[PDB]
């Protein structure tokens, strides 16, 4: 007989856990937790993204589901080496989170001419969808 209990997976605050800065000067760059100061402050390092090593509050960052093996208290040179070895910036770009993020600056960078072209293209696509939907 089964003894099923739901797991309810959570993003743990841990050494090696990759963060995403949402408030501050970075505002969208990737960093990794190096050492845990207390329940609300952590030490992060974003050397590939350009984030200086600093003590940040947990309310200014959002944890990502990416995790890589990083020693506790590893310096900037050590963090940057394990970051490229695990290819953190490649796994992040393949996630739907970054593809949803990268989509929204692309729409914000649309010119007035490009906004007209999107209108035309969506009208051609809507013709094919309506034809396919009305025959099934």
């Amino acid at each position: 007989t089964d003894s099923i209990v739901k797991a309810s997976n959570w993003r743990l605050v841990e050494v090696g856990r990759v963060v995403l800065i949402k408030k501050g000067q970075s505002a969208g760059k990737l960093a990794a937790i190096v050492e845990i100061i207390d329940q609300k402050k952590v030490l992060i390092d974003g050397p590939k993204a350009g984030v200086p090593r600093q003590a940040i509050n947990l309310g200014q960052v959002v944890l990502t589901p990416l995790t890589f093996a990083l020693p506790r208290g590893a310096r900037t040179a050590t963090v940057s080496k394990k970051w490229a070895a695990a290819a953190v910036c490649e796994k992040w770009a393949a996630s739907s989170w970054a593809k949803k993020i990268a989509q929204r600056e692309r729409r914000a960078a649309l010119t007035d001419f490009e906004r007209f072209q999107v209108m035309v293209l969506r009208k051609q696509k809507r013709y094919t969808v309506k034809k396919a939907l009305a025959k099934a």
Partner: protein, 197 residues
């Protein structure tokens, strides 16, 4: 942004939602509040029952019929909190109150319309996990509201009708996504993806 905004009162705080609505009413936005019987109040049930009893005993001595009127319905209890947040004795404050409608449960046509919530007023987003809260429907019944079972019977019937509508909508949405997925791999689909669409 919308002609009429319909707010679902379930899971909200009576004070933090009223202050949000009172500011929207003064700015000229029509607000309809549904399901006022599922509003939440911070503090245990015995706290709020004692507070209402303190309010209940406040009445004019020489004529009880012209004193403070202690309304028992959940819609009017939320209205009383909202009325004191608006300068209702002026012409500007009276016109703001005609832009507001509060109901128990979800009434007609506002049942066929979209309902929204106020993020800074949800009980789950403001209260610490472990704090005790009171339901407005249960508190109103304990002070003299006699329509809790009527609303609960009508609300149960409404949810059955809305579940059948969602099954048709969910099945139609899946058919739409199949045609939109077939719309991919084409020239117009790849050009749209280059422009962020």
């Amino acid at each position: 942004v919308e002609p009429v905004v319909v707010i679902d009162g379930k899971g909200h705080l009576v004070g933090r939602l009223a202050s949000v609505v009172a500011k929207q009413l003064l700015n000229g936005q029509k607000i309809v509040v549904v399901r006022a019987e599922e509003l939440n109040i911070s503090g245990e049930f015995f706290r709020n029952k004692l507070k209402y009893h303190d309010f209940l005993r406040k009445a004019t001595a020489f004529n009880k019929t012209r004193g403070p009127f202690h309304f028992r319905a959940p819609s009017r209890i939320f209205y009383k909190a909202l009325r004191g947040m608006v300068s209702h004795k002026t012409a500007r404050g009276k016109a703001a109150l005609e832009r507001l409608k509060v109901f128990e449960g979800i009434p007609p046509p506002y049942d066929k319309k979209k309902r929204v919530v106020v993020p800074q007023a949800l009980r789950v987003l403001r209260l610490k996990p472990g704090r005790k809260y009171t339901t407005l429907g249960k508190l109103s019944t304990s002070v003299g509201w006699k329509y809790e079972d009527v609303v609960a019977k009508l609300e149960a019937k409404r949810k059955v009708s809305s579940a059948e509508y969602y099954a048709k909508k969910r099945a139609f949405t899946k058919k739409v996504a199949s045609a939109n997925a077939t719309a991919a791999e084409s020239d117009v689909a790849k050009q749209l993806a280059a422009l962020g669409y």
